[PDB]
Write a protein that binds this DNA or RNA. Sequence first.
RNA 1: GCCCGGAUGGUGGAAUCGGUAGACACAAGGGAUUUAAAAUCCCUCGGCGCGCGCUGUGCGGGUUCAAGUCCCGCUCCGGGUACCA
Length: 862
Amino acid sequence: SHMQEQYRPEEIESKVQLHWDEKRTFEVTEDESKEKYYCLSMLPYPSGRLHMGHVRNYTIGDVIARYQRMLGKNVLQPIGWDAFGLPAEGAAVKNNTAPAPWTYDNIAYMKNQLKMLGFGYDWSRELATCTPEYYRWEQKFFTELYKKGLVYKKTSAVNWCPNDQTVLANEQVIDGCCWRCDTKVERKEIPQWFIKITAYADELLNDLDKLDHWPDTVKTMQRNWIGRSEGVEITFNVNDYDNTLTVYTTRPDAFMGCTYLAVAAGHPLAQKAAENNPELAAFIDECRNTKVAEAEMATMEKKGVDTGFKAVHPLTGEEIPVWAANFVLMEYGTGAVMAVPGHDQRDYEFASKYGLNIKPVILAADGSEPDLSQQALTEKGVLFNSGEFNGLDHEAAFNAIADKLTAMGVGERKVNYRLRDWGVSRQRYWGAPIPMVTLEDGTVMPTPDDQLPVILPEDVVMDGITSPIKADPEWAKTTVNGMPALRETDTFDTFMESSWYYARYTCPQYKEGMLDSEAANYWLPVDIYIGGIEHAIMHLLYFRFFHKLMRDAGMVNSDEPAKQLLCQGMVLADAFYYVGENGERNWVSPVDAIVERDEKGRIVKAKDAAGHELVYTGMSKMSKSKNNGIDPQVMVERYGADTVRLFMMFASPADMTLEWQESGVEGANRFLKRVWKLVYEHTAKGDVAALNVDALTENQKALRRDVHKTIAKVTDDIGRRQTFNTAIAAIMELMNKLAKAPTDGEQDRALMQEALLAVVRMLNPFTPHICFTLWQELKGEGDIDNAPWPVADEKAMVEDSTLVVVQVNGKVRAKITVPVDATEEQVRERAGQEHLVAKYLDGVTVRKVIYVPGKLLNLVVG
RNA sequence: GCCCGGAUGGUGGAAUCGGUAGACACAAGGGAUUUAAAAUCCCUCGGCGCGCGCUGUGCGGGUUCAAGUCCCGCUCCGGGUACCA
Ligand SMILES: CC(C)C[C@H](N)C(=O)NS(=O)(=O)OC[C@H]1O[C@@H](n2cnc3c(N)ncnc32)[C@H](O)[C@@H]1O
Ligand SMILES: CCC[C@H](N)C(=O)N[C@@H]1[C@H](O)[C@@H](CO)O[C@H]1n1cnc2c(N)ncnc21
Ligand SMILES: [Mg+2]
Ligand SMILES: [Zn+2]
C-alpha cells in the first residue's frame, strides 16, 4: 500500500487484470433485482493477430460497458469467436497444418491480447462457433426451417476454375484469371440450398421505421438493398418458339413505346437461337467470362447481339426484335425486360449504339412532344402515340394498361423485390455441415434428430484442391429409413453462425436446446450493438431476419434484436502488393515498403526492402487479407493498454472513418503522467477535511463550476453522443485548471479531493487500470468498477453572466461580458461603449439590429 | 456503373439546434532548468500586408443580417455490391 512517483504501467496493469479474473468482476447472472444492459460488440474472425480496427471496436464497447456498470446496472459484455471461414483453409495448406488447430492457435493468441488490453468481458460465456456444441443447434434449426417450407433447392451461378474443378470465392478471383493458376474462371450453374428471406421482405423493410435509435445511413442502405417495388409482369408470344417470355416493369405506362426486348445471357430463348446463329453462340460463350459480381456487370460496356426471334407486342400487334445483352440481371425480375429506349437512359445508349428504333410515347411537362436527339426523357407525364391510351396521366396509364393486360390474360400486378434469397451452400471444408440426406431411393430429406449433429472431423489432411469430407467417400455414408444414404458434403455460409451468436451468449452452456428462453428474454433485445459500417447490409439484415425466425419458433419475444446501432468508422491503412512469379498476389506491409511521395501528400512510387515494384491500392480497411494491420502489442508493451485505449478514443469520434497514424500516442502517455503526478502530490500531504459549500472565494467557486460542468458534458458525450474525443478533451481542460489552482489551504484541498475523485471516475471507462489504482490512493468506497457515476450539482453550475459577441455587418469587432438576465437595450448600450464598434458606426445609420439572447448581436449598417 | 458516407492549419480533430472558425492534442521552431542528455516547464504557431486590416473550412455558383453548417452542379477519397469476414 504505497504509491511511486513515476507512473509504471507494466507493474500496475497485469496486477489489476489478475484481480478482475480472480474476483470474477465482469461475470454476471440473470439478476432480477438489477436492471439489465446488454452491450454487444461484433465477434472477430480469429485471423491470428489483432489490429487497430479491432481495438477501436472493443474499446468503444468496453467504455460503454464500464460507463453503464457505474450507472448501477447489470452489464453483460460478451466475447466469442467467428471461427469458421475461408482463410483458415489456405493458411493451413500453406503452413502444413489442418484448419482446426490453426484456428485454435489464433483464438489462443488473440485471447491473450484482449486480456492484456483489459476489456471487462464475461469470459465464462465464451463461444467458439467451430465447435459442435455451437453448430449442432443451427443444424437442428435448419431442419425445422425446411419443414416450415422456408428452405428450397435451386440452380445458382458460381465461380469455377475449370482445370482444378473447384469452387472459388469472389476474393480469390483477380483481373479475370484465378489467383493460383493462369487459367480463366467460368460461370457454372450448380444446385444449392437457399433460405426464403424474401418471405420476410416487407417485415424487414417496414420495421426500419420502428428502429429510431439506428442511424439513417444504415437504414436507408437496407431499404435500397431490399428495394420493394410495385409493377407488372407482362407476358409475350414468339413466332418460331413455343415457350413464352415474361418481363417485369415498374413503368407499364410506357409499354406502347416498347420498340425491342433485351434478354439476359443465361436465358432459355438464347440457347434455341444460338444453334443456327454462329455469332450469337460466340456471345453466349463470351458471357461465361462474366464474373459473379454486380460491380463488373454494370461497369463493362453494354454489348449485345440480335437473337433473330421476333416477340409479338400484344397491344400494337407488332413484331419486335429480341436481343441478347450483358447488363440484364438473371435473378432480379424474370430475366428479360421491355426496353423503352426513349424514356430510359440505359436503354437509350443501347438503342443509339446498335441503331434500334426510338419511339416516344410520354409527353413533356408542358404538354409538348419530347426531343429525343440527345438523351431520354425519364420523367413521367401524359401519354400520346399510344392508340387508345392517349391523353391519360401516369396514375391512369399505370392502371389502364395493367387492367387491359389482366383482362387479356397475359399480364399481372406483382410486388417485386431487389432482395434475392439467401444461398447458404458452400463447397469447402471448414464450415458447419448442412444436415440433408440423399437416400438410395433418389429422394432428398432432412437429417433426422438422433443423427444431429453432423460433426465435421477436425483430424484431417488437405491437398488444397478438394475438401477431405468430399474426397473420402466413406464419410458421406449413413443409414436412414433402413437403407443406404449419402449426407450433404456442402457446408454452411459463415454468416449462419454470426446470425444468432448474440442470442446464444445468454445461455452458452445450455445442453437441452438452442436457447434457454428464461435467460434469453431477460437480456434480449440488445441495448447497444457496436460493429463496422462494413456490416451495414449483409450481416445486419441476416442478423434481424434470423431474430424474426427465432421469434416465430417461440424462442424470443422481441420483434427486433438490437435497440441502438453504433457503426464505428473503418480504421484505414495503405495497402501494397507485387505479382508473384506464377501470378500470385503477395501483399507487402506498409512497414516493409519504402515510399516516394508527392508534394500534396499522395504516393507516387513504392519499393520494398527486397526490391520489387509494388502496386499501391490506396487507403483501405485494416485486415490480414491485404496485410496492412498494425499489431497493438508493441505499443501496449511500450506505453501500456490505457495509453493505447485513450489514444484510439481521442483521435476521432466513434462514427468517423479514421486513417491510422502513430503520431499522437505520446500525448496520451503525457496526459496520464500529469494525472498521476497531481494525485501523488495531493495524497502525500495527507487526509482532507469536509468540504464547506458556502465558504469559497470567486476563484474557488469558478473552479468548482468547471468541475461540475465537465461532469454534465462528459455524461452527455459518452451517454447520448458517443463523442469520446470531446469528452476526453473536456477532462483535459479541467486537469489543466486544477494544476494551476493552488492547494495550500484546507478548502482548496477539500475541493481538490472532489475534483480528483470526479476526474478519476470519468477516466475509468477509457483508462480502467490507472483509475483502479488512483481510486484506492484517493481512498474511495470499494472498487472503482462498481462505484457510482458522478452526478453534477445544479446549484454549483449556476452562471452570473454570459459572453456576447458584437458584429457590424456580420464581422466581429468586440466581445463583452453581460449579466444573464439582461435586455437587448442594455447589450446595445454596452456594445456602443467599445471603440472598435463605434469606429464603424460613425458616418452611417443603424438600419437593422439582430440580437440572439446571451449569444450574439449583429448591427446591419448602411 | 449503382447505393451509403467523408474532405477544416505541417497533422488528428473542435464548433452539439444557421450564429466568435481552429477548442483539446500531436509535430516543428526558439527559450529555460540540467555536468551534456533524458525528463519536466514556458513562448510562438492558417495565410497575405501588427496594442491593426483583409482573407480563410475540397472545387464552381446561389439564398440570408449571418453559411464549415442550408440549396443546385462538380472533383477526389473510403465502405458495400450477395462466396472476404
Ligand atoms: C458478426 C460478424 C459478421 C463479424 C465478423 N466476425 C467480423 O467482422 N470479424 S472481424 O474480425 O473482421 O472484426 C470484428 C469487429 O471488428 C470490426 N473491424 C474489422 N476491421 C476493422 C477496421 N479496419 N476498422 C474498424 N473496425 C474493424 C468489425 O466491424 C467487427 O465489429
Ligand atoms: C421506361 C423504361 C422501362 C424499362 N425498360 C424497364 O422495364 N425497366 C425495369 C423496371 O422499370 C426497373 C425496376 O427496378 O428495372 C428494370 N428491370 C426489370 N427487370 C430487370 C432485369 N432483370 N435486368 C435489368 N433491368 C430490369
Ligand atoms: Mg487537408
Ligand atoms: Zn485456377
